[PDB]
Amino acid sequence: MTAVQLIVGLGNPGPEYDQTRHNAGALFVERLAHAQGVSLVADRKYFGLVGKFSHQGKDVRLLIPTTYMNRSGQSVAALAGFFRIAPDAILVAHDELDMPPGVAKLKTGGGHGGHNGLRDIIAQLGNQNSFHRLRLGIGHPGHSSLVSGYVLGRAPRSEQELLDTSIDFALGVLPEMLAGDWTRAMQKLHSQKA
Numbered sequence: 001m002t003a004v005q006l007i008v009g010l011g012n013p014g015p016e017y018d019q020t021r022h023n024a025g026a027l028f029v030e031r032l033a034h035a036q037g038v039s040l041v042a043d044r045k046y047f048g049l050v051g052k053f054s055h056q057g058k059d060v061r062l063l064i065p066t067t068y069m070n071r072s073g074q075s076v077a078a079l080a081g082f083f084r085i086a087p088d089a090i091l092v093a094h095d096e097l098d099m100p101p102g103v104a105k106l107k108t109g110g111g112h113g114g115h116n117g118l119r120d121i122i123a124q125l126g127n128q129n130s131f132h133r134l135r136l137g138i139g140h141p142g143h144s145s146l147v148s149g150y151v152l153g154r155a156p157r158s159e160q161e162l163l164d165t166s167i168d169f170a171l172g173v174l175p176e177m178l179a180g181d182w183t184r185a186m187q188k189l190h191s192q193k194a
């Protein structure tokens with residue numbers, strides 16, 4: 001229906017934040033770029049790492065913002081703005097507290113749920129939330145006061161492997177996602193068990 005033109009992977013920059021839970025989305029996009037043979041170029045204009053490849057005669061861009069997570073929108077709006085990409089043609093991959101490691105789901109629209117990357121993107125896109133999300137489960141620590149330390153921490157290896165597994169499931173529906181066939185992507189993805 002509407003082909004995806006931009007896939008954004010959320011995360012924080014630098015070695016300290018690499019491999020942390022809040023970089024799950026960035027990890028998805030890095031894995032996707034590697035599987036597709038796409039180079040991610042540092043591009044100051046877009047405040048991140050940008051990659052491009054062609055699919056069905058159209059350019060699809062990959063973006064990992066190198067802002068801190070709470071300014072991710074600045075990156076997304078700079079790139080979407082420049083190429084005139086509507087929210088409906090954007091997919092944002094991100095960590096999801098409300099699902100355990102090993103689970104990925106797709107969602108169109110909705111709020112940010114206290115995810116400051118999502119929050120900034122919604123604001124920067126002109127208060128538009130109708131982009132698609134790839135929700136990568138990272139589990140929840142069990143109280144609101146533990147969340148900040150938890151998402152900025154490195155998960156136990158078992159949870160990381162489960163995340164890797166969910167990323168693979170999601171890559172398995174890339175054809176559907178790229179085409180904008182969310183119904184099919186959802187049917188295939190949400191039926192998978194890690």
Ligand SMILES: COc1ccc(C[C@H](N)C(=O)N[C@H]2[C@@H](O)[C@H](n3cnc4c(N)ncnc43)O[C@@H]2CO)cc1
Binds near residue numbers: 117149152
């Ligand atoms: C503690 O020191 C730092 C260091 C770096 C950052 C960068 C970034 N801006 C961020 O990581 N953001 C947030 C939120 O996006 C994230 N987060 C995700 N879901 C959340 C929720 N329901 N409630 C609170 N924070 C949540 O927690 C992270 C750490 O507090 C932030 C804080």
